[PDB]
Amino acid sequence: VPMAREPTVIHGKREVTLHLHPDHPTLFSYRTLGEDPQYHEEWVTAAVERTIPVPVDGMEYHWGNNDPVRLWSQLTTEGKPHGWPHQIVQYYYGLYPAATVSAVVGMSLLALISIFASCYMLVAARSKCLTPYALTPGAAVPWTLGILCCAPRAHA
Amino acid sequence: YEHSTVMPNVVGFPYKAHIERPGYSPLTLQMQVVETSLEPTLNLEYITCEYKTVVPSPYVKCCGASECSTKEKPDYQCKVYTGVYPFMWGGAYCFCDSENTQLSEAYVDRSDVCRHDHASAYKAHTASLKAKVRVMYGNVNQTVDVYVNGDHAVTIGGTQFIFGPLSSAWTPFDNKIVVYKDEVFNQDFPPYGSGQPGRFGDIQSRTVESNDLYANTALKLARPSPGMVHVPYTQTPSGFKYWLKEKGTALNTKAPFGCQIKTNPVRAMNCAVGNIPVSMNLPDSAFTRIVEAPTIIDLTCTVATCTHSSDFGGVLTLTYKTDKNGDCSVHSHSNVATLQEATAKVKTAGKVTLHFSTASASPSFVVSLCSARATCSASCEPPKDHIVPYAASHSNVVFPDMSGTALSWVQKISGGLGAFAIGAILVLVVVTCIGLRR
Amino acid sequence: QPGRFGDIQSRTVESNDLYANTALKLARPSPGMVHVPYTQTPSGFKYWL
Ligand SMILES: *[C@@H]1O[C@H](CO)[C@@H](O[C@@H]2O[C@H](CO)[C@@H](O[C@@H]3O[C@H](CO)[C@@H](O)[C@H](O)[C@@H]3O)[C@H](O)[C@H]2NC(C)=O)[C@H](O)[C@H]1NC(C)=O
Ligand SMILES: *[C@@H]1O[C@H](CO)[C@@H](O[C@@H]2O[C@H](CO)[C@@H](O[C@@H]3O[C@H](CO)[C@@H](O)[C@H](O)[C@@H]3O)[C@H](O)[C@H]2NC(C)=O)[C@H](O)[C@H]1NC(C)=O
């Protein structure tokens, strides 16, 4: 039996573009060799072009009578690690683009809650420490007047 | 000296085990799983093949009537037709004009080559796993064949190895299996004695050599045409051929975890899942007395370049001070970085280099040269190439060190916010306590 | 590129120079034969047509 020609591979980001040149109907099949495989098989007849996914687990494709060939993706991305805070997020978003967003959102809401609580504590403390002196026509104690920014800057 | 460890069930992974006897020099073993084989247990149910309808010649009774008789044959059919006036090449015999009777007989039989082209229906349960592990250390190589269950101890150069049961219990074969030539199908075949015409297992034989046969193909007979002798009949086509045409997929090209299915015997080889516990028992001659081994002091670790790629894309340097030159047993005590070698030549110069493979942006692991220790930290850049034809040589851990850049930024920001919060709490408490003190 | 338009190119019709990239790879001959096997990606001009 004859062995068909090897296809031309073009590497992408977790993808392989595959140029197929048959002379007579050959069988082309591939599977992703992870926990949940991506099954597919076909009877390629004319000159076609296929795009097939290659996760970090890897995959194998069987073209005609040739032996199966396995390809593994590599931990590559587009961000810049060990840079400014807006570049580490890009680096960890190119990899795993589903947990980085959730973690960033969680941290941002935690920071907002903390800063709002702190500002509320400051406002409440000022209200507590300013209202007893706001019920009598008394001096604001310029020593205390300078320290805390109350409503009357200099008027009593 | 009893020792235990757990090694991944990944073919080709360079697992290295570190053995520390307090009275002697450390030892490093290299174990590697060259090949596995997951053998299930089968119980043959029946055998299916194409059928062959045999039609004996009709019996035409001239000037008389014939009576049908029953027989014990698989899917037997017999009928008698009255009023036939057959013809032959020269002249029409059965000289009576209309007092004739034809008897038609047909029955199904197993094909001629059913012992060469047939499909088997099995039942698979309780798979048993096998392996072929290569163990090298010191100056002893050699590959051995083992059973992966805690009931087989093999001796390699005076050392006894027991490979414990697999961590998981996952088998790609379902309860019912159909095997044809060199292909395995996860199919739900009908039970023996209840096949259906036109589909898989229309005729079922308990064994390829069994005499008993159960055939169900809706064979029927029709009245012959006038002036002919042909025994008409109608029959639903073979179920085996139509199963061949539309069986659909397989298990060879559908199995998970990237493991090949084979036949004779059925087995799923090189199938990466789970962990393989290991138990050892080493003799006193494998270790070296501490007096013979060189002494290592002032061990400092610096990383020249790092790159979290599949290949060994990191370089590490160790500086020390030594009295005499010899050999040491390097090891990395965390699975973040996987070293390449298990021995290194120490010399009076005070410099040695090692290569590691990692998959994290910022690793943090402790490396030991003979009896010394040193902590290494580094910053690693991603690789430029998109796809490689070899499997990864790291343990695939991605969480960075707590002293890395990103986590340092998180620590600084959280510390600033916590300082603000503590200041707010202190101000509020001071105000309340001043109000209460009065 | 092999298999597509312009896998072989020439400056002009009568030009002596020629650039060809068709992925021509030789294979080991079978035992007891003299046939110099090879494999090659089909013509790009025909598939362009
Ligand atoms: C030679 O041919 C003659 C026909 O020309 C055959 O005679 C036929 O014989 C059969 C039985 O031997 C007859 O069938 C039955 O006969 C009984 C007689 O009472 C009748 O009651 C039934 O209703 C039925 O017809 C048939 O009638 C008869 N035909 C005739 C006489 O014309 C003869 O059998 C042939 N020779 C041999 C050796 O078979
Ligand atoms: C322990 O034993 C194994 C098996 O004997 C050793 O592996 C063997 O290493 C040699 C040296 O590289 C290999 O020979 C060469 O293999 C290449 C592979 O392409 C080939 O092109 C060369 O012509 C040459 O044959 C040999 O294949 C290899 N064996 C296997 C089964 O892979 C191993 O090196 C030994 N351990 C130590 C520490 O020496």
Coordinates of N, CA and C in Angstrom, one line a residue, chain A residues 10-16 29-37 39-41 54 56 60 70-77 79-85 88 91-92 95-96 107 110-112 114-115 117-119 121-122 124-126 128-129 132-133, chain B residues 248-260 270 308-311 359-362 378-392 394 396 398-400 405-406 409-410 413 417-418 420-425 427-428 431-432 438:
Chain A
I10 N 1.9 24.8 9.9 CA 2.2 26.2 10.3 C 1.8 26.4 11.7
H11 N 2.7 26.8 12.5 CA 2.4 26.9 14.0 C 1.7 28.2 14.3
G12 N 0.7 28.1 15.2 CA 0.0 29.3 15.7 C 0.0 29.3 17.2
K13 N -0.9 30.0 17.8 CA -1.1 30.0 19.3 C -2.1 29.0 19.7
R14 N -1.6 27.8 20.1 CA -2.4 26.6 20.5 C -3.2 26.2 19.3
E15 N -2.6 26.3 18.1 CA -3.3 25.9 16.8 C -2.2 25.5 15.8
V16 N -2.6 24.5 14.9 CA -1.7 24.1 13.8 C -2.6 24.3 12.6
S29 N -7.5 11.8 10.5 CA -8.1 11.8 11.8 C -7.1 12.3 12.9
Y30 N -7.7 13.0 13.9 CA -6.9 13.5 15.0 C -7.7 13.5 16.3
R31 N -7.0 13.5 17.4 CA -7.6 13.6 18.7 C -6.7 14.3 19.7
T32 N -7.3 15.1 20.6 CA -6.6 15.8 21.6 C -6.4 14.9 22.8
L33 N -5.2 14.6 23.2 CA -4.9 13.6 24.2 C -4.9 14.1 25.6
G34 N -6.0 14.7 26.0 CA -6.2 15.2 27.3 C -7.2 14.3 28.0
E35 N -7.8 14.9 29.1 CA -8.8 14.2 29.9 C -10.1 14.0 29.0
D36 N -10.5 15.1 28.3 CA -11.7 15.0 27.5 C -11.3 15.3 26.0
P37 N -11.1 14.2 25.2 CA -10.6 14.4 23.9 C -11.5 15.1 22.9
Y39 N -12.7 14.6 19.4 CA -12.7 13.6 18.3 C -13.1 14.2 17.0
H40 N -12.5 13.6 15.9 CA -12.8 14.0 14.6 C -12.1 13.1 13.6
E41 N -12.8 12.6 12.5 CA -12.1 11.9 11.5 C -12.9 12.1 10.2
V54 N -4.3 22.5 19.5 CA -3.2 21.8 20.2 C -3.1 22.4 21.6
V56 N -2.2 22.5 25.9 CA -0.9 22.1 26.6 C -0.8 20.6 26.8
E60 N -2.5 14.3 18.6 CA -1.9 13.5 17.6 C -2.8 13.4 16.4
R70 N 2.7 13.3 17.1 CA 2.2 14.0 18.3 C 2.8 15.4 18.4
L71 N 2.0 16.4 18.7 CA 2.5 17.8 18.9 C 2.0 18.3 20.2
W72 N 2.9 19.0 20.9 CA 2.6 19.6 22.2 C 2.8 21.1 22.2
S73 N 1.8 21.8 22.7 CA 2.0 23.3 22.8 C 2.9 23.6 23.9
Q74 N 3.3 24.9 23.9 CA 4.3 25.4 24.9 C 3.7 26.6 25.6
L75 N 4.2 26.8 26.8 CA 3.6 27.8 27.7 C 4.1 29.2 27.2
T76 N 3.5 29.7 26.2 CA 3.9 31.0 25.6 C 2.8 32.0 25.7
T77 N 3.1 33.2 25.8 CA 2.1 34.3 25.9 C 2.7 35.6 25.3
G79 N 2.3 38.9 27.3 CA 2.6 39.9 28.3 C 4.1 40.0 28.7
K80 N 4.4 40.9 29.6 CA 5.7 41.1 30.1 C 5.8 40.8 31.6
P81 N 6.3 39.7 32.0 CA 6.4 39.4 33.5 C 7.5 40.3 34.1
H82 N 7.4 40.4 35.4 CA 8.3 41.2 36.2 C 8.4 42.6 35.7
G83 N 7.3 43.2 35.3 CA 7.3 44.6 34.9 C 6.3 45.4 35.7
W84 N 5.7 46.4 35.1 CA 4.7 47.2 35.8 C 3.5 46.4 36.1
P85 N 2.7 46.8 37.1 CA 1.5 46.0 37.5 C 0.5 45.7 36.3
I88 N 2.1 42.4 34.3 CA 1.9 41.1 34.9 C 0.5 40.6 34.7
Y91 N 0.5 39.2 31.2 CA 1.2 38.0 31.2 C 0.4 36.8 31.7
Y92 N -0.3 37.0 32.8 CA -1.1 36.0 33.4 C -2.5 36.0 32.8
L95 N -2.0 33.5 29.6 CA -2.1 32.2 30.1 C -3.3 32.1 31.0
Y96 N -4.2 31.1 30.8 CA -5.4 30.9 31.6 C -6.2 32.2 31.6
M107 N -9.7 41.1 44.0 CA -8.7 42.0 44.7 C -9.2 43.4 44.6
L110 N -12.1 44.0 47.0 CA -11.6 44.0 48.4 C -10.9 45.3 48.8
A111 N -10.1 45.8 47.8 CA -9.4 47.1 48.1 C -10.4 48.2 48.2
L112 N -11.4 48.2 47.4 CA -12.5 49.3 47.4 C -13.2 49.2 48.8
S114 N -12.2 48.0 51.6 CA -11.3 48.4 52.7 C -11.1 49.9 52.8
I115 N -10.9 50.5 51.6 CA -10.7 52.0 51.6 C -12.0 52.7 52.0
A117 N -14.4 51.6 53.9 CA -14.5 51.4 55.4 C -13.6 52.3 56.2
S118 N -12.4 52.5 55.7 CA -11.5 53.4 56.4 C -11.9 54.8 56.3
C119 N -12.4 55.3 55.2 CA -12.9 56.6 55.0 C -14.1 56.8 55.9
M121 N -14.8 55.3 58.7 CA -14.3 55.4 60.1 C -13.8 56.8 60.4
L122 N -13.0 57.4 59.5 CA -12.5 58.7 59.7 C -13.6 59.7 59.8
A124 N -16.8 59.2 60.6 CA -17.5 59.0 61.9 C -16.7 59.5 63.1
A125 N -15.4 59.3 63.1 CA -14.6 59.8 64.2 C -14.6 61.3 64.3
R126 N -14.5 62.0 63.1 CA -14.6 63.4 63.1 C -16.0 63.9 63.6
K128 N -18.0 62.4 65.7 CA -18.1 62.2 67.1 C -17.3 63.2 67.8
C129 N -16.1 63.6 67.4 CA -15.2 64.5 68.1 C -15.5 65.9 67.8
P132 N -19.8 67.6 70.1 CA -20.0 68.2 71.5 C -19.7 69.7 71.5
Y133 N -18.7 70.1 70.8 CA -18.3 71.5 70.7 C -19.2 72.3 69.8
Chain B
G248 N -19.2 2.9 13.2 CA -19.0 4.3 13.7 C -17.9 4.4 14.7
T249 N -17.0 5.3 14.4 CA -15.8 5.5 15.3 C -15.1 4.3 15.7
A250 N -14.4 4.3 16.9 CA -13.8 3.2 17.5 C -13.3 3.6 18.9
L251 N -12.5 2.8 19.5 CA -11.8 3.2 20.7 C -10.4 3.5 20.5
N252 N -9.8 3.0 19.4 CA -8.4 3.3 19.1 C -8.2 4.8 18.9
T253 N -9.1 5.5 18.2 CA -9.0 6.9 17.9 C -9.9 7.8 18.8
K254 N -10.4 7.2 19.9 CA -11.3 8.0 20.7 C -10.9 7.9 22.2
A255 N -9.9 7.1 22.6 CA -9.6 6.9 24.0 C -9.1 8.1 24.6
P256 N -9.4 8.4 25.9 CA -8.9 9.6 26.6 C -7.5 9.4 27.0
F257 N -6.8 10.4 27.5 CA -5.5 10.4 28.1 C -4.4 10.0 27.1
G258 N -4.8 9.9 25.8 CA -3.8 9.7 24.7 C -3.1 8.3 24.8
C259 N -3.9 7.3 25.0 CA -3.3 5.9 25.1 C -3.9 5.0 24.1
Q260 N -3.0 4.3 23.4 CA -3.4 3.4 22.3 C -4.1 2.1 22.7
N270 N 0.7 2.6 27.4 CA 1.2 4.0 27.6 C 0.2 5.0 27.9
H308 N 11.0 29.2 31.4 CA 10.1 28.1 31.7 C 9.5 27.5 30.4
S309 N 10.4 26.7 29.8 CA 10.1 26.0 28.6 C 10.1 24.5 28.9
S310 N 9.6 23.7 27.9 CA 9.4 22.3 28.1 C 10.8 21.6 28.2
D311 N 11.8 22.0 27.5 CA 13.1 21.4 27.6 C 13.8 22.0 28.8
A359 N 8.3 25.5 35.2 CA 7.2 26.0 34.5 C 6.5 27.1 35.2
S360 N 7.2 27.8 36.1 CA 6.6 28.9 36.8 C 7.4 30.2 36.6
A361 N 6.8 31.4 36.7 CA 7.4 32.6 36.4 C 8.6 32.9 37.4
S362 N 8.4 32.6 38.7 CA 9.4 32.8 39.7 C 9.5 31.5 40.6
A378 N 14.9 32.8 41.3 CA 15.2 33.3 40.0 C 14.0 34.0 39.3
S379 N 14.2 34.7 38.3 CA 13.2 35.3 37.5 C 13.3 34.7 36.1
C380 N 12.1 34.2 35.5 CA 12.1 33.4 34.3 C 11.3 34.1 33.3
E381 N 11.8 34.1 32.0 CA 11.1 34.7 30.9 C 10.5 33.6 30.0
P382 N 9.3 33.9 29.4 CA 8.6 32.9 28.6 C 9.3 32.5 27.4
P383 N 9.0 31.4 26.8 CA 9.7 31.0 25.5 C 9.0 31.6 24.3
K384 N 9.8 31.8 23.2 CA 9.3 32.4 22.0 C 8.6 31.5 21.1
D385 N 9.0 30.2 21.1 CA 8.4 29.2 20.1 C 7.1 28.7 20.6
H386 N 6.2 28.5 19.6 CA 4.8 28.2 19.9 C 4.5 26.7 20.2
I387 N 5.1 25.8 19.4 CA 4.8 24.4 19.5 C 6.1 23.6 19.3
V388 N 6.2 22.5 20.2 CA 7.4 21.7 20.2 C 6.9 20.2 20.0
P389 N 7.8 19.4 19.5 CA 7.4 18.0 19.3 C 7.7 17.0 20.4
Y390 N 8.1 17.5 21.6 CA 8.5 16.7 22.7 C 7.6 17.1 23.9
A391 N 7.4 16.1 24.8 CA 6.5 16.3 26.0 C 7.3 17.2 27.0
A392 N 6.5 17.7 27.9 CA 7.1 18.6 29.0 C 8.0 17.8 30.0
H394 N 8.8 19.2 33.0 CA 8.5 19.8 34.3 C 7.2 19.2 34.9
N396 N 4.7 20.9 36.0 CA 3.6 21.8 35.7 C 3.0 22.4 36.9
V398 N 2.6 26.3 38.6 CA 2.6 27.7 38.0 C 2.5 28.8 39.1
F399 N 2.2 28.4 40.3 CA 2.0 29.5 41.3 C 3.4 30.0 41.7
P400 N 3.6 31.3 41.6 CA 4.9 31.9 41.8 C 5.2 31.9 43.3
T405 N 7.9 39.0 42.1 CA 7.5 40.4 41.8 C 6.0 40.6 42.0
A406 N 5.2 39.8 41.4 CA 3.7 40.0 41.5 C 3.3 39.9 43.0
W409 N 4.3 42.9 44.9 CA 3.5 44.1 44.7 C 2.2 43.9 45.5
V410 N 1.6 42.7 45.5 CA 0.4 42.5 46.2 C 0.6 42.7 47.7
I413 N 0.9 46.6 48.4 CA -0.4 47.2 48.3 C -1.3 46.9 49.5
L417 N -2.8 49.4 52.5 CA -4.2 49.5 52.8 C -4.4 49.1 54.3
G418 N -3.7 48.0 54.8 CA -3.9 47.6 56.2 C -3.4 48.7 57.1
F420 N -3.5 51.9 56.5 CA -4.6 52.9 56.5 C -5.7 52.5 57.4
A421 N -6.1 51.2 57.3 CA -7.2 50.7 58.1 C -6.9 50.7 59.6
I422 N -5.7 50.3 60.0 CA -5.3 50.3 61.4 C -5.2 51.8 61.9
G423 N -4.7 52.7 61.1 CA -4.8 54.1 61.5 C -6.2 54.6 61.8
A424 N -7.1 54.2 60.9 CA -8.5 54.6 61.1 C -9.1 54.0 62.4
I425 N -8.8 52.7 62.6 CA -9.3 52.1 63.8 C -8.7 52.7 65.1
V427 N -7.6 55.8 65.4 CA -8.2 57.2 65.6 C -9.6 57.0 66.2
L428 N -10.4 56.1 65.7 CA -11.7 56.0 66.2 C -11.7 55.5 67.7
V431 N -10.7 58.4 70.0 CA -11.8 59.3 70.2 C -12.8 58.8 71.1
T432 N -13.2 57.5 71.0 CA -14.2 56.9 71.9 C -13.6 56.8 73.3
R438 N -13.9 60.9 80.2 CA -14.5 62.0 80.9 C -15.8 61.6 81.7

